[PDB]
A paper describes a structure:
Diamide insecticides directly engage and activate insect RyRs, causing uncontrolled Ca2+ release, leading to tonic muscle contraction, paralysis, feeding cessation, and eventually, death of the insect. Therefore, we designed a series of insect-like chimeric RyRs that contain the diamide-binding pocket from Sf RyR and the remaining parts from rabbit RyR1 (rRyR1).
This allowed us to visualize the binding site at a local resolution of ~3.2 Å. Compared with the unbound structure of chiRyR-I4657M/G4819E, the binding of CHL did not significantly change the conformation of Met4657 but induced an ~90-degree rotation of the side chain of Glu4819 toward the cytosol to avoid the steric hindrance. Both mutations form direct van der Waals contacts with CHL: Met4657 contacts the benzene ring and the chlorine atom from the anthraniloyl moiety, whereas Glu4819 contacts the distal amide group. The superposition of the structures of chiRyR-FLU and chiRyR-I4657M/G4819E-CHL revealed that the G4819E mutation would form a major clash with the sulfide amine moiety of FLU. This explains why the phthalic acid diamide insecticides are not effective against resistant insects. Notably, to the best of our knowledge, this structure represents the first instance of a diamide insecticide bound to a closed RyR, albeit for a resistant mutant. Based on our complex structure, which shows that CHL binds to the resistance mutant pocket in a different conformation but also disrupts the S1-S3-S4 interaction, future designs should focus on achieving shape and charge complementarity with the resistance mutant pockets to enhance affinity over CHL.
Author numbering:
A (entry chain A): 244 to 320, 331 to 630
B (entry chain E): 1 to 107
C (entry chain A): 1648 to 1788, 1793 to 1874, 1922 to 2047, 2089 to 2395, 2414 to 2479, 2487 to 2519
D (entry chain A): 3634 to 3730
E (entry chain A): 3779 to 3972
Write the structure that this text describes.
Amino acid sequence: LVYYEGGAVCTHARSLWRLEPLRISWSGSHLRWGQPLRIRHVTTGRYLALTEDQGLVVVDACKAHTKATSFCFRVSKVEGMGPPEIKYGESLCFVQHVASGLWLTYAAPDPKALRLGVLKKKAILHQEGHMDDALFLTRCQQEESQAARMIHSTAGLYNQFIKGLDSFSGKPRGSGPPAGPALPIEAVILSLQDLIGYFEPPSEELQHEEKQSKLRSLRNRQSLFQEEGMLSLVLNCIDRLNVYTTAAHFAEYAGEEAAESWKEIVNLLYELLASLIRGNRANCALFSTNLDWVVSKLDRLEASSGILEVLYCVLIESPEVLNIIQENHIKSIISLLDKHGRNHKVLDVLCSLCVCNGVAVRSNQDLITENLLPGRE
Amino acid sequence: GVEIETISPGDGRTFPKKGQTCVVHYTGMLQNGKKFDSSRDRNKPFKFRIGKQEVIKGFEEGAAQMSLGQRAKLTCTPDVAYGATGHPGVIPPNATLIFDVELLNLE
Amino acid sequence: MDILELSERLDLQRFHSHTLRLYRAVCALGNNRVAHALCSHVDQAQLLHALEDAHLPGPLRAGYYDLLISIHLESACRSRRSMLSEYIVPLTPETRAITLFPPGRKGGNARRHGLPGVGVTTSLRPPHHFSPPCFVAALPAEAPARLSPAIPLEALRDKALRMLGEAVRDGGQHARDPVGGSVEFQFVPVLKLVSTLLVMGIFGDEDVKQILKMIEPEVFTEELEEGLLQMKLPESVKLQMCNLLEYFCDQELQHRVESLAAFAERYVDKLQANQRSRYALLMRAFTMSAAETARRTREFRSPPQEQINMLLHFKDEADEEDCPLPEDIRQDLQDFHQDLLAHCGIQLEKKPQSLQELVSHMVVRWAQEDYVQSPELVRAMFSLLHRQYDGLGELLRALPRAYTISPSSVEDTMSLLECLGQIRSLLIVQMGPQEENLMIQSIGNIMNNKVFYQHPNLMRALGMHETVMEVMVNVLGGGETKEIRFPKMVTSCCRFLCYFCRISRQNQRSMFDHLSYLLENSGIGLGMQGSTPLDVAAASVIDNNELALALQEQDLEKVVSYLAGCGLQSCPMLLAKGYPDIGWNPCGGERYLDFLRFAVFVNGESVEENANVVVRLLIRKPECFGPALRGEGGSGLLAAIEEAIRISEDPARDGPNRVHLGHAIMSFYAALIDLLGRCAPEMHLIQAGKGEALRIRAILRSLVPLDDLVGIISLPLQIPTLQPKMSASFVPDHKASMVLFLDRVYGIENQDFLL
Amino acid sequence: ACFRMTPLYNLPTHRACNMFLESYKAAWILTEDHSFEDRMIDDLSKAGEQEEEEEEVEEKKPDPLHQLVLHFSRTALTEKSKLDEDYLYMAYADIMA
Amino acid sequence: VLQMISACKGETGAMVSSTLKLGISILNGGNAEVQQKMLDYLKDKKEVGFFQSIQALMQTCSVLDLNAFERQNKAEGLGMVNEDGTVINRQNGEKVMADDEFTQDLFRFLQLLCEGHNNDFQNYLRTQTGNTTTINIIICTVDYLLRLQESISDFYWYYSGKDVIEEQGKRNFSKAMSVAKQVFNSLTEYIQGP
């Protein structure tokens, strides 16, 4: 469904559209009045169409046979570059379906609850339309546009991995024939190794102005990967993979050829998630409900670097999650020091449970004194 | 039960009575051998009034049985000193307390 | 194993280095409870033994200095630092003799500034309280989690200075292995301790005269050892030197205001005495000339402050003089004001021989010979020379925090000042149930001190109303109504604010300015009793008669938008008790409207400008009216209340507030018409000689028909007999809201008074 | 009210002093020191690079004023939501004008 | 100064007021050289960051309101409190404008930019090449010199039926007309030097 929205999604990947003309050559030429063209949503990877009765529905890339989409621009109600006509921000073009000859406007049927609730309207190809469309265009072709196709490619490569992984949820292998459809492993390892490099934090030797400039271009992209999922997705992979305990031996009934490539896949997700959380503040608030889940494990023989770092970065920004530890999470991390040796990293984390930025909390600034302090071992 | 084992002999005639101050230069220990208190690292002797319930029960029933100038060794059972919740941060709960008390002056 | 060999492990030291950081972190911003438990763990002796020790791994024991400064101090430094801004001074015989070094001879009048900080200050500051640790004491179960740990301050003072005496001599001698490893470990941790002990004023007279001798050549020798400001230093100890020099600037400032108080005593005394002599000269004795009585008007008329302006104008003025004083008391000002404008900065047209010259000539040298990194440093010295170049600017920005009081009341204020400190420490710490208890007695003891009634000007200069305001905003800050954690404290504190607002007019203004701030977070947490932030918002303007004229519309507009909410909601908290909650909540509406009553009139049916815009704004949103009337379905003028009467004696219907629901419905509509009876256009002063107000009268008269209104004054419930009734149903006491609704809208005229 | 306005000679000494100071804001607020304005940028900034410098190769050590302004530029570029008060900035912004 | 204004998005606090006061002092007269440096940076950083502030800030400027005038006209009726130092605020001018000391400098800052018939700012302010979006300050200032005009004409009707203008009817009136003159000066300096 298609809607309208104010100054909230205007800085989001949801409201990005791509225009694809019907020709194969000179598709990048100047756009002029009276020219059929298609409309594509970038992160959804889908077009817009009205097939027979469902309305202006976002159709996939398999049922768009140049008749359901069939859009063009109208002023009112060539083997070269072409004449440049349509400007940015003031062209005031009018959208019109070619085959049906209709005009696009908002139905805006709003009940009492809808007026004071969701500020959302639905667009329909009315026969005569309203008088307040004046659709003008704005250009956003920059680093964020490159980080738009990435969402579709990665989100289309991840869920297929879990879905294929989910098939053998509880079937011990019939030794010999491993399974049905195979699984991709080389693809994902290269994929994850890119984003961690892509999200790699700013360096240290750079001057202030260059460091500050890139610091704005990293926080935005970190938030841009949350509004399109990809936090649940990386969470979802951990849920499925972490079922297989012990080592690759228990993962044997998934294809023993992929068993020896178990440790690194389990590892690579964790520091990836650390990149999406480190520095940024809004994303850190999401883990208040999921705090119990991350603190739960703290024990896998191959999780040490991943878990201690992801926990370290969520207690450095948000004091809200700091207030959601009752009595047992403290002794869990205390026991971590007792089982993994003398590690200064854990002791540093306990300092985070202490005074936050300016403000200090006393509800938990005694439990460590009475649990890890009286015993002298 | 307070087990008073002597370490150095004393006068043997002057004993503390009610409503009377004492100065005691103690140093307390646990059963394991870990020291939790000393009044000689501060170089300030502990002074308390007997009978007004300032000190714990094991300390005053321990200081009443000694003489002036005597130095003894007590073993206070956990029932008579910090039974259940204890003192948080110093003494663990259900721990036996050992005191090397020495009465300097004034009974 | 020995500690001294941890300098050669580099891995066990790293673990232990963070360990003593935890102890610094466990001792949070004031945690006297768990602070003492560390005393049995770390020490009381080897800390005092770590001072003189020289063989030092670096990030180790040199870090103990930051633990010694955390378990024994900043329990008063964190409080006494806040005490350094206000300069309350009492009337004392010692204060009567303060000047610019009056043992000066001729040249000493225009020179000999005196060493910064000697003594005699007479300022009011709370004393430090400390307790000795004792773990054999009887089980307690008073002081907040406890008072404080103790330490022999006498030993620390002598030891620290002697330790620093080695530092200056050793630094000049030079070596390839300084104490701690690299020079700065030999300086920064030890003189940081000096600075913290200095603000508490543990050092006295003789002691500070030696710390100045560490920069001997200029400051000392009032009547070899090269100064600390002579040699090249790294970019860290220089920052600490600024923290040390900064403490001395305000010491001169504190000396400055006391000198004014000294002049603010003897000169006002003769002024009062000489003014009485001016009375009897022109009193009943008098003479003639008639018009001379017109000339003598300040002497009996005008408020006392106005008299001071007239008699003080010509004194320090220039040339022209009107209504002058005898030319004998107008000479000391031309000397004192000259004397003052020779000490601070005024030229009034080598060896620095002055702190002003020393600091200014030195800070410039540091920038000329280095490109200073670490922005936190460069911000420090640039705040110094600005003060040393604008003397009067600091003084002019300090007097509004100065106040003089009289003896026999200092003891009463001393309790108030000490008690007020605990509130300031409450803001930094997050709200705790034990800490929540502490404030209630704290604020309860504030409103009994006999001083928060006589000198309101103090309490705006200390500004505790500012500090207590953040206390409320932190606890109430939440996503929705579910975040009502820690109740019973907003009510216990909001009561104090209301009484503060009813002590003086200027007190009303000072808190009024936060009206927009207050209403932003007021109409959410509704449902408790006693008080609510909305009440103090209403009490901010009740009798001013000029504050009401100083509204800004948007405040009135936004509170109306709140009332739009209670016309369509269902009160889910009220619903949580399992109640019908049919269409709307009268409980919430009766609170917003009570506020509007205090902004339409101020004293006997006046101020109509804001009243005019209220009715023109309220009509725009018809949903503001209860849907029983002023709608499309029906109105039920005499039926809506009658319907409430039917549900009044219907316990099954009700909710199976704390009394019933029908009374709440009666409360709403009665209160609404009470609003639109005093929001009337005006008295007949305007309605009989103008044509603007008649427009408003026609509007409001068209919304309440008189035929139904006249009939509503009838049907009283009953009278106690044989057994009284209950204040849960639609009573009759609150029916007088329809009496004033007809007394000033339709009014009596013909002979319908009989009916 | 204007006839019961008590005379000045019945006021307590402690209260009759606070009114003096608040009213005697008529000798500082009008007096002008000038001073720090022209002598400031003279001794600071200009003539800052004295004979202390011994040698140079390609660039020059920034003079004392140059550190000051870049500091304000430094804190201006800090990634924040809303600028703070920083009265220190006001004190130097005006004197530069 | 360009970096300081850009940081403060749209809040007309004491921050920009003490900053805009500075900017007038550097580039009084014509000062061709300082204008060149400012243009180079805007062409170099190539972020918007700044024209958003100027556009937003001047839309918050006040005009000659009338309703607020009545609030003075009765508040001035009182002369002193019961007994508290009389009206301490005395003038208490903050109402009708409370901004003339500031809004008169914002336009002066813009006018001094296009001084000496510089033909780059006089073209840059119309449209910003490159970047991402344009603001067109030119048309964004004429709208202000229309709401202000509707305010003075309004004020005239309130005094149409009287015969003499009282002293407080002229003190505020001259405040508004002085502001309008400063705006008119700017409009000329976008056109001078064709």
